[PDB]
Scaffold this motif. Structure first.
Motif, PDB file in Angstrom:
ATOM      1  N   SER A   1      -0.332  -3.877 -10.305  1.00 19.05           N
ATOM      2  CA  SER A   1      -0.727  -4.391 -11.613  1.00 19.05           C
ATOM      3  C   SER A   1       0.231  -3.891 -12.694  1.00 19.05           C
ATOM      4  O   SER A   1       0.793  -2.793 -12.596  1.00 19.05           O
ATOM      5  N   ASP A   2       0.413  -4.711 -13.724  1.00 20.26           N
ATOM      6  CA  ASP A   2       1.314  -4.392 -14.822  1.00 20.26           C
ATOM      7  C   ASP A   2       0.532  -3.961 -16.052  1.00 20.26           C
ATOM      8  O   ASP A   2       0.880  -2.992 -16.726  1.00 20.26           O
ATOM      9  N   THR A   3      -0.525  -4.706 -16.341  1.00 16.96           N
ATOM     10  CA  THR A   3      -1.372  -4.423 -17.482  1.00 16.96           C
ATOM     11  C   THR A   3      -2.806  -4.721 -17.094  1.00 16.96           C
ATOM     12  O   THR A   3      -3.183  -5.884 -16.959  1.00 16.96           O
ATOM     13  N   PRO A   4      -3.616  -3.668 -16.868  1.00 18.79           N
ATOM     14  CA  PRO A   4      -3.175  -2.272 -16.975  1.00 18.79           C
ATOM     15  C   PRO A   4      -2.266  -1.950 -15.806  1.00 18.79           C
ATOM     16  O   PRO A   4      -2.312  -2.635 -14.785  1.00 18.79           O
ATOM     17  N   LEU A   5      -1.441  -0.918 -15.957  1.00 24.22           N
ATOM     18  CA  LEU A   5      -0.511  -0.515 -14.908  1.00 24.22           C
ATOM     19  C   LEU A   5      -1.209   0.341 -13.849  1.00 24.22           C
ATOM     20  O   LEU A   5      -1.584   1.481 -14.109  1.00 24.22           O
ATOM     21  N   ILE A   6      -1.372  -0.217 -12.653  1.00 20.66           N
ATOM     22  CA  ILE A   6      -2.027   0.478 -11.549  1.00 20.66           C
ATOM     23  C   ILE A   6      -1.107   0.551 -10.330  1.00 20.66           C
ATOM     24  O   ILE A   6      -0.368  -0.393 -10.036  1.00 20.66           O
ATOM     25  N   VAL A   7      -1.150   1.680  -9.629  1.00 21.35           N
ATOM     26  CA  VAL A   7      -0.327   1.872  -8.441  1.00 21.35           C
ATOM     27  C   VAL A   7      -1.161   2.409  -7.279  1.00 21.35           C
ATOM     28  O   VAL A   7      -1.986   3.298  -7.469  1.00 21.35           O
ATOM     29  N   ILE A   8      -0.949   1.868  -6.082  1.00 24.29           N
ATOM     30  CA  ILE A   8      -1.685   2.315  -4.900  1.00 24.29           C
ATOM     31  C   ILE A   8      -0.716   2.901  -3.887  1.00 24.29           C
ATOM     32  O   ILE A   8       0.362   2.352  -3.659  1.00 24.29           O
ATOM     33  N   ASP A   9      -1.099   4.016  -3.280  1.00 30.43           N
ATOM     34  CA  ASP A   9      -0.239   4.674  -2.307  1.00 30.43           C
ATOM     35  C   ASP A   9      -0.998   5.224  -1.109  1.00 30.43           C
ATOM     36  O   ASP A   9      -2.170   5.595  -1.210  1.00 30.43           O
ATOM     37  N   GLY A  10      -0.308   5.289   0.025  1.00 32.82           N
ATOM     38  CA  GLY A  10      -0.925   5.777   1.241  1.00 32.82           C
ATOM     39  C   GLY A  10      -0.609   7.217   1.588  1.00 32.82           C
ATOM     40  O   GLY A  10      -1.004   7.679   2.658  1.00 32.82           O
ATOM     41  N   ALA A  11       0.097   7.930   0.709  1.00 29.82           N
ATOM     42  CA  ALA A  11       0.436   9.332   0.963  1.00 29.82           C
ATOM     43  C   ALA A  11      -0.781  10.018   1.569  1.00 29.82           C
ATOM     44  O   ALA A  11      -1.916   9.719   1.191  1.00 29.82           O
ATOM     45  N   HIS A  12      -0.546  10.937   2.502  1.00 27.33           N
ATOM     46  CA  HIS A  12      -1.636  11.631   3.184  1.00 27.33           C
ATOM     47  C   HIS A  12      -1.620  13.168   3.187  1.00 27.33           C
ATOM     48  O   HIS A  12      -2.400  13.806   2.471  1.00 27.33           O
TER      49      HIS A  12
ATOM     50  N   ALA B   1       0.793  -1.224   0.000  1.00 29.17           N
ATOM     51  CA  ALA B   1       0.000   0.000   0.000  1.00 29.17           C
ATOM     52  C   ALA B   1       0.830   1.282   0.000  1.00 29.17           C
ATOM     53  O   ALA B   1       0.284   2.376   0.098  1.00 29.17           O
ATOM     54  N   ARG B   2       2.148   1.147  -0.097  1.00 33.20           N
ATOM     55  CA  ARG B   2       3.031   2.310  -0.130  1.00 33.20           C
ATOM     56  C   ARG B   2       3.736   2.378  -1.485  1.00 33.20           C
ATOM     57  O   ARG B   2       4.775   1.745  -1.692  1.00 33.20           O
ATOM     58  N   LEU B   3       3.152   3.155  -2.398  1.00 32.08           N
ATOM     59  CA  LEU B   3       3.661   3.324  -3.762  1.00 32.08           C
ATOM     60  C   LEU B   3       3.916   1.934  -4.340  1.00 32.08           C
ATOM     61  O   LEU B   3       4.974   1.648  -4.890  1.00 32.08           O
ATOM     62  N   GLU B   4       2.910   1.081  -4.212  1.00 36.37           N
ATOM     63  CA  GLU B   4       2.993  -0.291  -4.676  1.00 36.37           C
ATOM     64  C   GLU B   4       2.309  -0.547  -6.012  1.00 36.37           C
ATOM     65  O   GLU B   4       1.113  -0.315  -6.173  1.00 36.37           O
ATOM     66  N   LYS B   5       3.090  -1.034  -6.969  1.00 36.40           N
ATOM     67  CA  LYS B   5       2.596  -1.362  -8.299  1.00 36.40           C
ATOM     68  C   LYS B   5       1.851  -2.687  -8.169  1.00 36.40           C
ATOM     69  O   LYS B   5       2.470  -3.749  -8.192  1.00 36.40           O
TER      70      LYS B   5
END
Length: 410
Positions: free
Chosen positions: A305-316, A299-303
């Motif tokens: 998925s590759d296709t489609p390319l998705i990234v999730i981050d916890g920045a606040h 959950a911290r700037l974590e890729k």
């Protein structure tokens, strides 16, 4: 009770506070055979970076052959993730037994002191200590809830104490100045026990300096006793060199992005080296190297998925996301879609004045207060509908990131 009742039971605890003492949990721990007084511990606190450091400390120690318990917060996917042994969340069935054991203990006590009770965090913290002793771990890396001094976990004598950094983020509970807030965190420093800190700002550095002179503790600070001479991006991570009194461990690789993570890793490495020596346990550069190559911070700037390319981050916060616009800048040259769930319009200007397309959605599990979409799903579907090959980055809150991860991976 079954898992469900058990978890529901833990969250039912009353809202109590203001307790410079630890008598409540100490009373409970006593009935639990004082497990907090047995075994080894590493106490970790900090405004930003404590979670990351602790996670890196554990991996390194695990890779060296030790069975390591880990107590952190919050949980991303499941609640069981609050208590891990060798990075394995506590099994549901095991949680049902522990909860039940700590409950009978609790109940015996209320039969003597009718109005005796405990808070949620105190109950969870007590159960973790018992559990770690039951499973007989070699060492448990304990993450402070907030501050340190009066934190429910601050009832142990660690082998080493870690203090990543001091900031005004929790200024509502700790204090109004750096100084006041630093006094709390220094509370986890014990007589004769070494402390490893990042490069604290002057007000906080004075608090620790004076604290250690009192406990006669050895103090290793980032950029003084150890440092990161070289560092750079290597794929979806960084390649850097660690240097301290003993020398260099060059070209280490961590699947972590964000130049600030360099200081957290240096802290983890240095801290782990202090634990090994203090307990005359052998730790090699190979152990460290392999331990970091696995320090995945979900959950911290974590890729995800590759296709489609998705990234999730916890920045606040603003600064919290300011390390992002620069982080996404380095990793991407092409046009991207940012889906943010911020809480305010102050940050919105930094994201809008940084990327082409940017959608603002609500953060799940939060009321609706007074570029827009009704949910990240709608924002995600629209993006994948309009420009399929455009990478999507989701950020704004740890709870939003957590919700997408549970949906897309779970």
């Amino acid at each position: 009770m079954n898992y469900t009742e058990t978890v529901a039971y833990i969250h039912s605890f009353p809202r109590l506070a203001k307790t410079g003492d630890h008598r409540r949990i100490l009373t409970l721990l006593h009935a639990l055979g004082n497990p907090q007084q047995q075994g080894r511990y590493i106490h970790v606190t900090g405004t930003n970076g404590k979670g990351s450091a602790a996670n890196a400390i554990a991996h390194v120690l695990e890779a060296s052959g030790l069975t390591v318990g880990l107590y952190t917060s919050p949980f991303i996917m499941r609640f069981n993730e609050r208590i891990m042994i060798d990075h394995e969340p506590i099994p549901d069935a095991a949680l049902v037994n522990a909860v039940a054991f700590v409950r009978a203990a609790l109940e015996r006590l209320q039969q003597q002191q009718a109005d005796f009770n405990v808070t949620e965090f105190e109950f969870i913290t007590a159960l973790g200590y018992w559990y770690f002793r039951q499973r007989q771990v070699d060492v448990a890396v304990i993450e402070v809830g907030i501050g340190g001094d009066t934190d429910s976990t601050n009832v142990i004598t660690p082998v080493v104490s870690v203090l990543t950094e001091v900031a005004l983020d929790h200024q509502k509970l700790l204090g109004h100045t750096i100084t006041a807030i630093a006094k709390h965190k220094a509370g986890i420093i014990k007589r004769g026990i070494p402390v490893v800190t990042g490069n604290l700002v002057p007000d906080a550095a004075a608090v620790v300096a004076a604290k250690v002179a009192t406990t006669g503790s050895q103090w290793l600070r980032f950029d003084r006793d150890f440092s990161v001479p070289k560092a750079k991006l290597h794929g979806w991570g960084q390649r850097f060199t660690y240097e301290d009194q003993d020398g260099r461990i060059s070209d280490l690789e961590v699947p972590l992005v964000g130049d600030y993570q360099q200081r957290n890793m240096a802290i983890a490495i240095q801290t782990a080296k202090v634990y090994a020596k203090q307990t005359e346990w052998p730790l090699t550069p190979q152990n460290i190297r392999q331990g970091l190559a696995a320090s995945h911070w979900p959950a911290r700037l974590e890729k995800i998925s590759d296709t489609p390319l998705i990234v999730i981050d916890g920045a606040h916060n603003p600064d919290g996301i300011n390390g992002l616009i620069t982080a996404l800048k380095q990793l991407f040259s092409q046009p991207i879609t940012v889906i943010a769930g911020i809480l305010y319009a102050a940050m919105a200007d930094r994201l809008t004045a940084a990327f082409s397309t940017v959608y603002l959605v609500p953060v799940p599990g939060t009321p609706r207060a007074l570029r827009l979409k009704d949910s990240w799903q709608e924002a995600l579907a629209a993006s994948l509908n309009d420009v399929p090959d455009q990478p999507i980055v989701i950020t704004g809150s740890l709870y939003l990131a957590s919700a997408v991860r549970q949906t897309l991976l779970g």
